[PDB]
Design a protein. Structure first.
Lengths: 331, 334, 330, 333
């Protein structure tokens, strides 16, 4: 299976390189010429195109990974529908809802897979907890807890065009909530503060947030987010149900424990992007390919992307109105 | 020693009365309970000097220096005001009252009489939560940003009790609101609450919920989230975490034993604490020694009437939030 | 049940005080006039004898706790036997195999209970582990691991007359191995070194040791000891068998965990004698009293005291001769 | 850097495949006596050369370095052929069960001036290596007591056990090496004992399936290794070092970080159980280091002499089992 990748930023590059551990990297494309040939050589790719559309039209290209900037997503995904190429699109699909509907509509017409880039679904720990809950191991779920904290904020100029913490960061946790609980959120309440850097405040965003979710069954969820955990990534999930509790913890660098007069000390948490995420991207990409090879529905759909976006809008509205907000209000 | 009288020989009054042997320079001098055989039996089991059917006779007994009010909640106000009129130092089990005006009167009268009013928030004296509070207070996690509390019981109380309890926010979350203030060292300004009926439809029919989440906004902008369940089948689950600018701190549940069994499926740890006495006995013992210390030493109580009042107000704000589906400021309830 | 306690050192005093939590502390005895008066008062005890033989002969004393120095044990225990008093004896019964055999002989003669003070069998975590093993939970036991480390060495003078690490420290581990595995050790190999304190070696003992056990079934055990673990007591037991593994860890002060840039940090280990052991001593004493009251064989017998002493001799011999030593040789 | 792999067994195949993930080296040649395996793997890996005769692989001038992953009785002759062809050589454990052969392997590679790297892959286990570096940095002060527990989920086949040299040469070998690696000093004396508790047949072959080995180090520090051929729960490979300033421990790895809680308490995920999930990363990192040593002209990270010492410790333990006493390393050198 021949794959073409568009956009060789940090994530496009991970996917491009991961291909040799899977299906074939057959084409790359990026608007920086330097990087383009550098990578054509480095990775040994058959074709390099500086214009995304050529790559989409090359008949040896069975599927496209769109990993370009966000403003670019709608156009390229719609272009793949045209060429009748299956398409994976990195997070987020779009921040504009009408664009999302078109991406969904157009790919549906072309009868081509649209896979949304929610990589955490393929984290081995989160996927295992997902399966156990779905298998009945904690009975009927009552309360979901998600904590998601990054080691540092992204750049301010980024934050300014990000759509805020609920669209840029909580998006992954909204998707995770639906995935793990296996039912829709109907209502959201959100609050957020500026506790890490005054500039995030001046940009109109928050760096610390809590979101409550009310699911169709009556089960409740709480997400909490922070842009700066000094100890590294903190991404934990818990589900509590009629028959017990299940929890997914962080991964540490090592299994080594030092004991001195103050007690035990474990190893540092995962802190760096690649050590934290490379396996989830690898496993996500293999699933996208598996889906294409078998003409399966995508493991993560355009719909999934749209619901996550809608929950983000409900939370932005809740934050401003100081009340919980039903998803209707926002569709 | 100090001579103590205990009113109410229910589950918790009995614990306090028995702990008095474990405490020194305090003795159990008198007990009172309205069930005559209960009173008779406990007088003889514990070798108590005086047993009174009428608690007012206990309070007026001149040998009694301080009183533990552990009778039904609807009697707390009357008994605590009666201690103030008798000039007796008073400890009152949670909750002080479900009626805000009664709590204001209780605080007024004891203050007038110049006697201690100590509110029985025993979890402040849990060795794990206390150590976490001290670490936070010390600067160990930097400036606090997010609080998390999970508090789940192995089983709901009986329906009869649920109907008169004021609902989950006044009867259960009350401890978590106090813990929040105690751990974070600042006031809550706003609350949002939701709740569902997921354990017993009867709780729902009685107008209450059995599962709830409560969001707190503190004065500093720090946020917190409490979640409660009336039934965790694995036993008590009471965890606290604080996340701040310099790290994270967490207090876990206690297990029965340090033993770990490993088989084909992996490691299996010991059961969680599950029964009331094994869970709570040490926190009650330590709470009571503190009350006695404050009394003997003339100190302000470690947990005051005002602490009882604030927890109740947060409960009323949450009850209003639940019904109005919106964030509620403490002021709208003050 | 009226108990007399002989010798009010660290442990005697703990037994004496626990009696309030249980049976009555009727009589106390200690050669130190001052310590005696000071304890009669503070514990409110009826009788106080500077002469232990008085206490044993008191007709109102039903059972005796012998918690004086090891060299007094044999005489007091035989004396309780003579006066028909059930007797509890603190670790160790004796360093002298002939005494032990006598203590056992005399007590059997007088038809009284002789309970050996191996309190660790009554540690809540070690007891739980023992019950799981006996229950079949890990199937047939194959390998036992015991690590036992104290936070500091006892004083030099004490070490000089202690009998060496195998008699003074490993004794508890020898006994725990027999208790946990439910069968006898037939052969032992030991080695030891001086890594903590030069003076311990100067007194002729070792401060670090390892002991291999061969059990009747062919199961193997390994004990390691150290006189000094700066982090607190380290007392772990692991049993590995045909159906799984079972482990008892040490106890921490608290369940609190602090996380910073270097990772998670837990609370300190138990470090002081009383927080570490008081609960085991209380449960041990309750069990002895229960044995007394119900006319039961003691939970921990003279013969238990004897086997642990024999295993200790087998280990001192292995250490000197650099080979495995069968119990038959000792 | 063009690599040739001899022996496409379990471990040879893992090395062959890992070359894909090592930028400075490619799999250029493979060789194995089974014509079917050779044709199969040639296709599967897309290898340029496949040689039925490992000597032709060795003499191929395009081969820069060789991984000898063939049966043990083959190692001596092929490593000596590498020295003759002036090819750097990595040899899978064990180097040889025969001491005179180990000496010739060492002598010949030294005379040819090529690296001989012994495949003790567990030194490259990320947990064990981190513990070794911590001990080396002084974080537990002076080491006093070493504990190693090493249990496999199941025994090898009996036909294999018969020619394995017995538990101390086939299994404990890894632990003897780890002991020297972690403690950074030599073992002067060993005591060993062992029993037959897993499978009667193992003992009929003259072996044991459960063993303990005490180590006395030059410093006076003491160590104890215990082994078992069958832990139902998976690999159990733990290391603990205790010393004057504290204790350090490397635990087993679990499949996931997920914990399930019910009436009886917490339940963690299964331990690693299959060969590949357990060992693949240690082999990847071991090979990378070998490639590094070769490229940079460095001494091997694990030398022939490392292999010889682990063998000598094996012999000392075998003697101790039989003589029921402690055995000095001198006795067997």
């Amino acid at each position: 299976l021949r794959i073409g990748v568009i956009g060789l930023g940090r994530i496009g590059t991970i996917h491009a390189e991961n291909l040799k551990m899977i299906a074939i990297l057959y084409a790359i494309s990026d608007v920086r010429e330097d990087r383009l040939r550098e990578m054509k050589e480095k990775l040994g790719v058959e074709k390099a195109y500086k214009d995304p559309h050529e790559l989409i039209e090359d008949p040896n290209v069975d599927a496209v990974l769109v990993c370009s900037s966000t403003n670019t997503h709608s156009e390229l995904v719609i272009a793949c529908a045209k060429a009748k190429k299956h398409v994976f699109c990195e997070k987020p699909l779009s921040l504009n809802l009408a664009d999302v509907d078109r991406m969904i509509e157009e790919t549906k017409k072309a009868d081509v897979i649209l896979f949304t880039g929610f990589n955490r679904r393929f984290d081995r720990n989160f996927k295992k907890l997902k399966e156990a809950v779905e298998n009945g191991t904690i009975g009927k779920p009552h309360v979901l807890r998600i904590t998601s904290r990054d080691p540092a904020p992204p750049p301010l100029d980024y934050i300014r065009v990000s759509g805020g913490i609920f669209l840029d960061m909580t998006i992954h946790d909204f998707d995770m909530a639906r995935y793990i609980m296996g039912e829709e959120v109907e209502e959201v309440f959100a609050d957020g503060s500026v506790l890490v850097d005054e500039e995030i405040g001046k940009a109109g965003d928050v760096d610390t947030a809590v979101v409550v979710l009310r699911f169709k069954s009556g089960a409740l969820g709480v997400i909490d987010n922070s842009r700066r955990a000094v100890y590294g990534y903190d991404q934990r999930i818990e589900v509590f149900g009629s028959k017990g509790r299940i929890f997914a913890d962080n991964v540490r660098e090592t299994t080594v424990v030092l004991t001195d007069e103050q007690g035990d000390r474990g190893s540092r948490y995962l802190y760096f992007f690649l050590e934290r995420y490379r396996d989830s991207y690898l496993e996500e990409l293999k699933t996208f390919i598996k889906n294409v090879k078998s003409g399966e529905p995508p493991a993560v759909s355009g719909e999934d992307g749209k619901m996550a976006l809608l929950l983000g809008y409900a939370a932005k509205k809740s934050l401003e109105e100081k009340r919980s907000v039903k998803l209707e209000e926002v569709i």
